[PDB]
Every structure is written in C-alpha cells, then in structure tokens.
Design a protein around this nucleic acid. Sequence first.
RNA 1: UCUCGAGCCCUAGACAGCCGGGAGGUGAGCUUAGAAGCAGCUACCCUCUAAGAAAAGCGUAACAGCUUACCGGCCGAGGUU
Lengths: 29, 70
Amino acid sequence: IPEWKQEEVDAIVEMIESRNTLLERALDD
Amino acid sequence: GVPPTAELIKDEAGFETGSGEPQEDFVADLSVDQVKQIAEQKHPDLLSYDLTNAAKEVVGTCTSLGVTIE
RNA sequence: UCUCGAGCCCUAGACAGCCGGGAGGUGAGCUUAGAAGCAGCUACCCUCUAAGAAAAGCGUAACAGCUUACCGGCCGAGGUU
C-alpha cells in the first residue's frame, strides 16, 4: 500500500479533473 | 548556440577563475537582476518554460563556485 | 536434497527476462596544452518528467561507444533476505 502510489492516483485524478494501473485506478474514480 | 554559462558569469562577475572550494570561497556576487539577464541569453539552451525556472538552472552553477547573490 | 522458523516485497503486478526510454543547463569548477561520469582536488546543485548520477563498471590519446542505476511496457504468482 505504498504512499507514493496513493499520492500518484490523487495526483492523476487532479489532472484528469481539470503506470497503466494507476491511470485506470484514477479513471475508475 | 549561445555561449556557455561558466563564461557569461565570469563576465558580469568581474573575475576570471573560480574558487578552489565553492560556496566556501565566495569569489564573486550577482544581483538577482544580473541573473535575470543571463537567463535571457540562454532561452534556447534551457528546457524551462517560465523565466523563473530558467534562473534556478543558472542560479545553480553560481553558488557552486563562490558566486553569492543579493 | 528433505524439514522447521523469522524479516521484508507482491495482482495498486512483486523476482527474473525481453522491448522501449535513459534527456537538457553542461564538455560542472579547479588542475592542465587537454581531461568532456569515470588521472587528481572540490563541490555534487535545478529544468523537463513516467524516468534519467556534477555518474556504479568497462572503454578512449582525449571524444566516441557499451552498459548499472533510475522510468514505462510486455508477462502473471509467488519472490527475496
């Protein structure tokens, strides 16, 4: 449950709002 | 293209050689404005977008030679 | 080769392999005729970024070149101490 993987998802979701797995994870939100 | 950093500094610095030990032996100084100009002469050689970052790059070779700022 | 135990990592994809990326300021400053990751001394900073050392090992007269780091993909189940 690495903290950087969590900060990334939130980081991605931040760009979408305005690693493939992380991108998918975000998109799923 | 445009000449390298090391030299552009030694010009507006007024000196020719660096210090045996950087940040420890301050050879020259540079006002922020002075660094604002150098950062303009290297607009092509640098990857930065805003002039702000361009400085950090230039402002990185100075303190590493004894080139304090004011 | 068999058996028992502990720590850590892992389907938010681990370990290994293979493919792709490994970039700019800048060939850092000094020393030196020259030295550009890699003779020596000192420092070892910040941009773009998903990564990418002021360079871990070869290599060169010095470059070049080939790779480690580091990141991404393919893969899919245990792996490692």
